[PDB]
Ligand binder design. Sequence first.
Ligand SMILES: COc1cc(CNC(=O)Cc2cn(CCCC[C@@H]3C[C@@H]4Cc5nc6cc(Cl)ccc6c(N)c5[C@H](C3)C4)nn2)ccc1O
Ligand SMILES: COc1cc(CNC(=O)Cc2cn(CCCC[C@@H]3C[C@@H]4Cc5nc6cc(Cl)ccc6c(N)c5[C@H](C3)C4)nn2)ccc1O
Lengths: 527, 527
Amino acid sequence: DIIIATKNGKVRGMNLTVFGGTVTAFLGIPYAQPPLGRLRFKKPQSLTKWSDIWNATKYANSCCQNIDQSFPGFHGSEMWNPNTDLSEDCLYLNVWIPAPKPKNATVLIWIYGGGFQTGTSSLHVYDGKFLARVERVIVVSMNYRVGALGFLALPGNPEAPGNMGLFDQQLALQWVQKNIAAFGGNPKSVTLFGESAGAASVSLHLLSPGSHSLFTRAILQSGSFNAPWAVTSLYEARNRTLNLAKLTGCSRENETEIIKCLRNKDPQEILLNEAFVVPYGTPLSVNFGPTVDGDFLTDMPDILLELGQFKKTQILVGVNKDEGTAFLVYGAPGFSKDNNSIITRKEFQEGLKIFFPGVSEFGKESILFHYTDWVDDQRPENYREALGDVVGDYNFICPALEFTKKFSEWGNNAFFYYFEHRSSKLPWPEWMGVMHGYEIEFVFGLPLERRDNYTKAEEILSRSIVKRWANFAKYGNPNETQNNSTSWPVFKSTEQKYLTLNTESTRIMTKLRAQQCRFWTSFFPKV
Amino acid sequence: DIIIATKNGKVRGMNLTVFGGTVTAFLGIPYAQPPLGRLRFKKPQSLTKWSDIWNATKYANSCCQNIDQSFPGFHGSEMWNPNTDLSEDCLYLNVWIPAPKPKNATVLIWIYGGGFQTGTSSLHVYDGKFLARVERVIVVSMNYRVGALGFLALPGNPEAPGNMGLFDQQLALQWVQKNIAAFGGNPKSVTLFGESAGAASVSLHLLSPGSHSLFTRAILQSGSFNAPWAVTSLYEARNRTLNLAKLTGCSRENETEIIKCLRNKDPQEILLNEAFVVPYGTPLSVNFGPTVDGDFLTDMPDILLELGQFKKTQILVGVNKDEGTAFLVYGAPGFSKDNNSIITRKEFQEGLKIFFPGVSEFGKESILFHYTDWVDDQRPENYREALGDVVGDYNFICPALEFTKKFSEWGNNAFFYYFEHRSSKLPWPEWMGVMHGYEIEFVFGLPLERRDNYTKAEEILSRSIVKRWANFAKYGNPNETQNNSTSWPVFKSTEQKYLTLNTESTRIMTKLRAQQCRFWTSFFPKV
Ligand SMILES: COc1cc(CNC(=O)Cc2cn(CCCC[C@@H]3C[C@@H]4Cc5nc6cc(Cl)ccc6c(N)c5[C@H](C3)C4)nn2)ccc1O
Ligand SMILES: COc1cc(CNC(=O)Cc2cn(CCCC[C@@H]3C[C@@H]4Cc5nc6cc(Cl)ccc6c(N)c5[C@H](C3)C4)nn2)ccc1O
């Protein structure tokens, strides 16, 4: 029986067998008052004690969110859908502690991705237990609100200010600052790590003054705030709040009662009109994300990092290879999970309009041009791969590079990775390659588990990445220093060195897709 | 005393010492009635005998043309200005014969370049004597009308049909067909070769049915009809004839008397309003060139070669490296023959408007984009070199490639060269590099002459090129088969192999500037 006193009560945990060792987990500790009734759309309110024992013995409820049934019964998509009851009562977190309880352990905090419209800390791929077992860390993860009940914005209005999600994340960070010592954690060795919208969340934490003192280092997987999908400007933010109002019969004259109307609408007629608040969409449409609110983010994030007003510290950021491929089975003509998807050029041109609906007609022809440059017109596959690369480079790769590029030019240590192994177990077709999101099971160390159908090479790939990620957390260098493995250079402007990740050899390279990125970074911003 | 009977009289020549041998030259034989009085703007009329001896002992008059004094006293530009009296009486040609007089020699015919506005067969760099001496060929060269008295067009009107210049060239070809046997020539081994507008002339001979039976093979140096400057469409053709009419006080109602007015204007008030017939110009402005006339060219040349209605035969076509550089000292801001000409980007942007005056504003930004892609922003020279490459690739290189590319796809042997030696004697600044036009002295073999300040390496470069050019004429392969020198591949679509030309080694390469050319060839045609 293991039970530990927080600042607001005492909480009972569970003992887990992990690799012939044990790990303590406390699943579903509450950190913010349930954001219900009067309290939805507002910023999370801190707790009052219980006295009483909170049995942190089950994963709490996932926050309200839509669910992806494009493919019902297909593991490849349902593995990301929540595995808990949905409820606007969801501001809970989970900590995993090594056993015997450590004394001054580094803390790793996970923020899950989901285009800010979906997701939960409860997924099997986010199971922190292997990290605590193997590298004797404390893994923490929290649920933050999502979709419109996380990011609905009327700016300047505390009834619905925008960014209530990131604010949820940060009160979780606050809780770690005050409580983790109880658990044997060190509130001065705290490194965030997320993927996708989570990656974009942790990059936003770097710029938010409110979050400067609640962590030390940062890990960015497949996301950054400067990605085109990540921040919504105040004009669209309002154009989609006031929109959501029209399809829920809430359209009024006085902002301070649109909002009261919207909180008497039951949670779900909110969630299914969320998809329409925008005329044209893409598979990547973040209908309600971060905004510039003058609170969490005090103005346009691209400006403050270009001016360099951010936390100064080491960061670890990378991307996967075929990051664009996942999204083309959700719109693009000729694409299916159930064939090789050999598109013709005309289909490629209509693919581009879904992913760049407007955006001028020419803007598309120059995107087409820069990628159609066949090496050479032979190969039937090449339109197919071209449309994956455009979506991947535009939406993820080039931002990450251009993110870390300028984060280093202010003196900080940055390390960039490129993760090229496709899982032997990936349930998506081979043509999709090394998909967005399928770095994560390796980071969390699911293949270290030997009863699970990963290949032996993948267990050694995972053990390696787990150690680097580990060491970057404690000591700020992604070193694995003893089995003669590749040294990891610092990413600087000019040289721009990145380490690759796969089963075979781990190389050092420069210029991660420089030709492509500089189309997207230097010129497309004008069209 | 050497004197030989043509079909229209007998002509006396001269004996020249060339390299301790002798060569017979007959300079200034007339081949067409003087195109004067009633006869200007019309097609050249064939001769009636003289009986009488025509002493072909001096270079005849150059046809009327403007003269380039941008730089008076500068050898580099005046070496192209005529060296004979100007006169609309100018339809004369020159033949050089080996001694002892050959018996069935190959005939080489030279058509000089000049943007169709200038030029003459009398220049020292076109001195055919070394070719006849060294490789025992017969070199022939003719003067053809130029500027408006060569190419003024009102289409369908035999009083001024257009293309009277190429028609002059072709009656010269006719004369060779009927007379060259007298001189010891073989009217069935006849290969044309020109440079620049001359190159573009000989490519037009390939498409003209009237010229199919007057030659066998073709050499194309630094020009082809598909170049942007080479063919004028019937709308501008008329818009500049009727224009020329307004500035010479000839504007009338009845085409059949605009023309009679224009022939009572003395030759020179024609030539100096030639420059204004167009609102905006460039240094490359061909104010009166070839047109589609339905006689010499029976319709749009790009269509008939794309459909492949041309003479089927081997061709030899190439370009020089810094072909764009010569023209930027005639307009582009920041450029001078008397400094290193390090331009700034803004000057580069105004350079582009002179060379692409309109042409939309964006069209320019995408030209800028595709070339500004510094390797990297370091080097001060790079705007300067960029603007040379745009002019060279647009105007000469990419057309030649795209010309020969499709001439081969119909089964014919094509060989492509890339000439990279800059003359040790070039009077233009080093920054200009391997200039347009400065292949020719090597082809004619001026450095074979040893009293002349070329370097020893240039004499061996010239002897080599003279032999290839030679052998391509007789046997249709640009082979120099005995001193272990590089074999010359055939240029085909797909592989696209070209031989380079310089002092050091002669390499075989593929893909002559493929990235650039395919911007100009595939996409710019739309803007
Ligand atoms: C119409 O009802 C809705 C339904 C949904 C469900 N959403 C989707 O299917 C959107 C989607 C998500 N993905 C990723 C391929 C599968 C791996 C992961 C699945 C996850 C949902 C998601 N969305 C992202 C959006 C952006 Cl811009 C960037 C990354 C995303 C992402 N990583 C993920 C993941 C990983 C979780 N393809 N399409 C969202 C919003 C709705 O309004
Ligand atoms: C205003 O009076 C005029 C004066 C002129 C004199 N023209 C020029 O200076 C035009 C020019 C020509 N050149 C080439 C650099 C020197 C080497 C050669 C000089 C020759 C004139 C000429 N014009 C060409 C135009 C085109 Cl598109 C292509 C090639 C050309 C060319 N090879 C030459 C050469 C080579 C003979 N740079 N600018 C022409 C027309 C006029 O109306």
